[PDB]
Amino acid sequence: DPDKICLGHHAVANGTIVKTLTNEQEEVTNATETVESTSLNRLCMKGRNHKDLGNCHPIGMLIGTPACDLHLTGTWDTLIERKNAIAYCYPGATVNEEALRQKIMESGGISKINTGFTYGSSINSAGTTKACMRNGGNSFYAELKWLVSKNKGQNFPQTTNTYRNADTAEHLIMWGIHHPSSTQEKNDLYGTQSLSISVGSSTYKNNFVPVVGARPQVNGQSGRIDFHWTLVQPGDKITFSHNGGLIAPSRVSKLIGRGLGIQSEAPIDNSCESKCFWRGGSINTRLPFQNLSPRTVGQCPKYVNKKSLMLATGMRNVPE
Amino acid sequence: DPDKICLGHHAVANGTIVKTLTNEQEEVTNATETVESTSLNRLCMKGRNHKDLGNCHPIGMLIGTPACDLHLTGTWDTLIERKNAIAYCYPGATVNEEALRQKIMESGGISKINTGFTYGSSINSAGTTKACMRNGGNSFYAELKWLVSKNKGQNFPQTTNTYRNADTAEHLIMWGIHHPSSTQEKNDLYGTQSLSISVGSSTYKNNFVPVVGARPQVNGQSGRIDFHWTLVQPGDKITFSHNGGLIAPSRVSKLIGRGLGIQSEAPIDNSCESKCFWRGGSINTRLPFQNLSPRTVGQCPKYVNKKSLMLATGMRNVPE
Amino acid sequence: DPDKICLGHHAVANGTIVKTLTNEQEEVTNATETVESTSLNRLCMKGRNHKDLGNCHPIGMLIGTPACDLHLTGTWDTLIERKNAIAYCYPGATVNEEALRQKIMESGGISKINTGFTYGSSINSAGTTKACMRNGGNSFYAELKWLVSKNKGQNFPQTTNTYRNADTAEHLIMWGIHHPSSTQEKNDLYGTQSLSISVGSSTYKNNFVPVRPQVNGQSGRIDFHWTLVQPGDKITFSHNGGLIAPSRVSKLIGRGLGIQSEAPIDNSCESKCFWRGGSINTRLPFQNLSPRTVGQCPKYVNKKSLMLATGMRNVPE
Amino acid sequence: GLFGAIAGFIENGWEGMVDGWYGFRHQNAQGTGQAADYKSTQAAIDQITGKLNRIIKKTNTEFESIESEFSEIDHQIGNVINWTKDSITDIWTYQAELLVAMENQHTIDMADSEMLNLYERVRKQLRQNAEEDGKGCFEIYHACDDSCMESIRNNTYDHSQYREEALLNRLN
Amino acid sequence: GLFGAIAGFIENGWEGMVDGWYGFRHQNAQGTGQAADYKSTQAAIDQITGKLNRIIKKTNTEFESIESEFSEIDHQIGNVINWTKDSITDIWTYQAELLVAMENQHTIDMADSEMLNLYERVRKQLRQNAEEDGKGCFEIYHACDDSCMESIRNNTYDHSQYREEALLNRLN
Amino acid sequence: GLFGAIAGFIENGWEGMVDGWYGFRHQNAQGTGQAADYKSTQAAIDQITGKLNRIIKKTNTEFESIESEFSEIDHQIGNVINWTKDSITDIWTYQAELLVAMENQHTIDMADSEMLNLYERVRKQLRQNAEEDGKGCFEIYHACDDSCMESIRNNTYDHSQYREEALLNRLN
Ligand SMILES: *[C@@H]1O[C@H](CO)[C@@H](O[C@@H]2O[C@H](CO)[C@@H](O)[C@H](O)[C@H]2NC(C)=O)[C@H](O)[C@H]1NC(C)=O
Ligand SMILES: *[C@@H]1O[C@H](CO)[C@@H](O)[C@H](O)[C@H]1NC(C)=O
Ligand SMILES: *[C@@H]1O[C@H](CO)[C@@H](O)[C@H](O)[C@H]1NC(C)=O
Ligand SMILES: *[C@@H]1O[C@H](CO)[C@@H](O)[C@H](O)[C@H]1NC(C)=O
Ligand SMILES: *[C@@H]1O[C@H](CO)[C@@H](O)[C@H](O)[C@H]1NC(C)=O
Ligand SMILES: [Ca+2]
């Protein structure tokens, strides 16, 4: 029995199983997770000049719906949209609704510019309705004007308005067209004659004839006001020749800068910081991968079809 | 002392730092780069039949804008488009413009086939304009004709013209629709009637009505000539039914073969060869990766978000 | 003088070349393919409730073209379109044709719901034609009705039918407009009155005015249009004659795999991956048959062969 | 090779050895034998099986058509699909080429190592009763019959039995 | 394993050892002891730290929304999006599984290699004063007190101090 | 490293050795010399040449423009392209980093292995005529002139020619 020295290595009782190139049940001493499964149910907004719209819908704040009074202008780096958001108090739909919505959510602020659209004595520029309630009473969209005749019954005059883009950047201009759903309502507001609404810039052109038919009643209104939009470039005009029916703009919007567009139901939290978001909330994690959702925004871990992927942090566990 | 033999390896004084799986500052005896950082601010066109369009927009070749008089026909394996290139002398736009542009920039040549269209006494088919100048005088799109009534105020006759594709490959037929600036101009040119323009083939059906209304002057012109296009297959016929408003084709196009389309401001250099191009020029690297631009065309290295990735081509440097 | 024990390893006479990180021509004892080159030219439909449409185009299923009669309804987990498949017995096209076709191939069955549309005594809704031949005789689209006047000269009555959506799901409704080339043809058919058609509903609404080469020996055309009727919504068609009317409307149920192929059927073989040329029933991870595939597939690669080593370096004697 | 045995200090393989991947060949007074080593052969095969199980596999992701076979698509969106599909095909082509090349490298070296681990196991068994030939063989310095040779292969060789004899033969 | 030590000629690990990853256990006249080896333990942990620094990492790319949560998207482009997202997810799932598998394989063998390097360093020190056990131990052929043992563990054991004595004990 | 020679028991590299990657230094009565081993050097170089042939390469896939440089792209489809390109670039950036990091790790350890294979080839060649110094050297226990040292390098050293003398000196 000579003197002996033995080389050896450590081990553990609670060894973890990992996958290797050759072995699917390889036991190592320690390991750590690479796919994140936990998610906070709260929009982490520390170090972020954010804007929670809440009731308001992104399109809404260009036209000026009652719900978007707080959000008509302002600058931000993040913009949060909620479910079932009110874009239209008076019923109707925007053509290229989705393109408009994306461009607003992509922006980092809104500035309003006045059109300077004056109207004659025979026109009633301050027309209102019971659908869009502001301060508990009849009203209309803030950034538009419902143009009807002053005397009930008479014809609407052939007037023409024109906005000049004096700014060095592009402006977004919007306008509605009243589809009245009644020949009685069409005549006593606008006139008996056939109405024609023409729009035209250097880059855009279109003609609009108000169709009339009994549409289903929503918000207590059978008629419709369908909106259309375009971008007026720097140094360009845009004309609005109309013989009644038009809802012209009093103000035009300028989407300024860049910002993150988040769609989620979860609430704000201004104590926590994060850079990855999704419908269910925030993903504040150091890990490279995740299995919460494929639809995320900002600086995110990559989505993988894996519950777990264990990365070995130690040698083979060989117990006695 | 006993006789000794010592095994060993080389080293160098100034080594090179690379990254391994386990170490970000690993000194090795030699390394080489895998990400190309440098670009030639030139378009390397050696061994390529190329066409620099210059001031000509590729669509302008098809409709024959004055700018594209040297580019109405041709063949090439590479086609070079430039900034602020001119498609439209008289103002307007093409429907599916970017689809058409991309289709032209994908071709390897254009041929022209006469359509042979003829018109009555009452139609004036040589109506030029100040917006499109050629040889110091008023002119028009070389491959189209402006059809207008010869007697001012008179109704344009319900005319019918048909092009059969006699060739064994598909032909690209283009036509314009004029959109007048007022009810005065529309009546002076095409008369007081309701205008309709129908274009029909086996594979295509569409109707067009000239929208009329006030709008800004582009190139001193309030009116717009918008363009349309389709493919007419071998043997198939395409018929134009029109009663004023049609800008009728006098020629149709055939896109021949295949070519690489480049959009760049950089000048041509016929001394260097290349298979990769971007806005700023050519990329002649043999390296696998590249950090110049994500927008590239041809046989390119893959864009990566890295300044440098050094590939070890030598052992660890352990200096004396 | 001393005894010997020698360690060694097996070899084989016929080795196999593989590529390693350092060596392009590295010979090993055994290797196996990872890229599939062999393609079965047969659609493998074992364990699949499938509908080979054959001569029928998916649009034509919804309007009832003579070639489609056997496919007007069904349930399936797979749908197979073919080349040159007939969609229209009377010439024309759908308003948003290719958008509709892909919606049908995305679905896993069709069930038709009767609209229950009655018309007056003067009008005659059984407008047959020599173009759409059925049962060895003149006929029309099965799911639509050709509305002409019973009096060959008399003007067409301004009729309006309505359809409320009873079911809880969305119902797909299709209609159109007949135009002859000339005016003289149009006047005898539906009267001299310059009529028009307009369909109105919850979301959709548009007007259409009856405005080339000839197809299937017919002078006039039938231009088709479509929209999804919402659940608990009323589609009312307002017309003054000269518009074909839907007798039934379609309902798409669930989803299924829309295959497009020229290759014939075989229910002995099974597969989860399909392409134009046929089926891909391979266990291998990669494939070089086509970049266009559908289902659960091996990934397309620009590689004829990739040999994975399954044994040591081959070192012969 | 990384571990220096296969295509290294061992000149070449043995086409004769069909019953396993690694093994022994001996010579002694009474003649000659050959036998496979099961443990090292199976360790190599098992490791290659695990690669095949991981690699010979496809995803369970359902892919519907975005390109019509029998009809035209819009030319812009068609080009966007063509760009995307070619980009994804370049990724998978590269990933496959790398995977296979990397695994082939690993397999070759893994197999090399098992040869060396068997060799080093025998070296330590024989201890001072043998010396390394250089060519993957051990010149044993004592009378080692087939039961002795079997004990070396089966790992029941006790060096002390033959130590007194062997050291004398090694020294003179 | 590749280097043949861990889960190899060292038959098992030592659960008792909690101040190190690799280490020593001795037996001499004075009795049994145990000590960690710092240099080899750190080499292993440092290499593992580097991996964690490189892998526990996300890209800095700002991805914006291309699919709407609260509204319908156009049907043709949504299919292009769905096809693309699914394809990207298959890539990342595959890249993640390959990464982790490859790193685990490397981690295990790297650790095995540090065990071998420590064994080879001790072997070369002891020189002709000891002989390999076959189980990861060295039978030393002289009186090795706790200072001699510490001198082996601390890489300061001088073989020529005990050479004459040990060579006589071995030959016997 | 993995194989324990370079940045291991070989204390450092030789800046003087400039006609090879691996080689010999010797000392004897006649003086000092140096020489490079050709075969082991080219083995390491050829493997690195192989890496470069595979890695220094682009795909032969023609890509067309899907984004216009000089005109406004449709907003919805342009977001899809922006999202897609950024996803592809993250994959290729990640893949490039993983490619080089892994290859760098393999190259280093490959070169380490060729140093060790040369050392082991010399050890087995010298047999019982030498002893491992522990720093990559071999203390040879006989008169080894320049021609004797040349035969160690050229792999024609016969150990039995010097065995009688060498064993007597080792045991003393
Ligand atoms: C998208 O790619 C496909 C495949 O490369 C193109 O289809 C080819 O087009 C022409 C015929 O028009 C021929 O080269 C081949 O017959 C077609 N190939 C296949 C496999 O069908 C297609 O043109 C491309 N799309 C666009 C919009 O450019
Ligand atoms: C190669 O290995 C496979 C298992 O992957 C086996 O089935 C096949 O028979 C082997 N090939 C040869 C030629 O032995
Ligand atoms: C895209 O995927 C989502 C989630 O699987 C699904 O609900 C939706 O129907 C798909 N979109 C289209 C247009 O098919
Ligand atoms: C897409 O990205 C480019 C380059 O980063 C940027 O200039 C452009 O604004 C983006 N386009 C859209 C439509 O978001
Ligand atoms: C290798 O070197 C030895 C020793 O100097 C020399 O004698 C021999 O000739 C060399 N081998 C060959 C093949 O030349
Ligand atoms: Ca293309």
How many structural units, i.e. domains of chain D?
1
With helices defined by DSSP (H or I, 4 residues minimum), what is the helix count of chain D?
Answer: 4
**Which two chains form the greatest contact, residue counts included?**
B-F, 71 and 81 residues
Can you tell me the CATH architecture of chain D? Alpha-Beta Complex
**Beta-strand residue fraction of chain A:** 35-45%
Largest sheet of chain D: 2 strands, antiparallel
Strand content of chain D: 5-15%
Rounded radius of gyration of chain A (Å) = 30 Å
Q: How would a textbook summarize the main sheet of chain A?
A: 5 strands, antiparallel
Helix content of chain A: under 10%
Strand order of the largest sheet of chain D: 1-2
Q: Which fold name is given in CATH as the topology of chain D?
A: Hemagglutinin Ectodomain, Chain B
User: What quaternary form is this?
Assistant: heterohexamer
Widest beta sheet: strand line-up of chain A: 10-13-20-15-18
How many separate structural domains of chain A? 2
DSSP summary: helix tally of chain A? 3
> How does the helix and strand content of chain D classify structurally?
alpha+beta
Q: What is the 3D shape of chain D?
A: rod-shaped
Provide the gyration radius of chain D in Å.
Answer: 27 Å
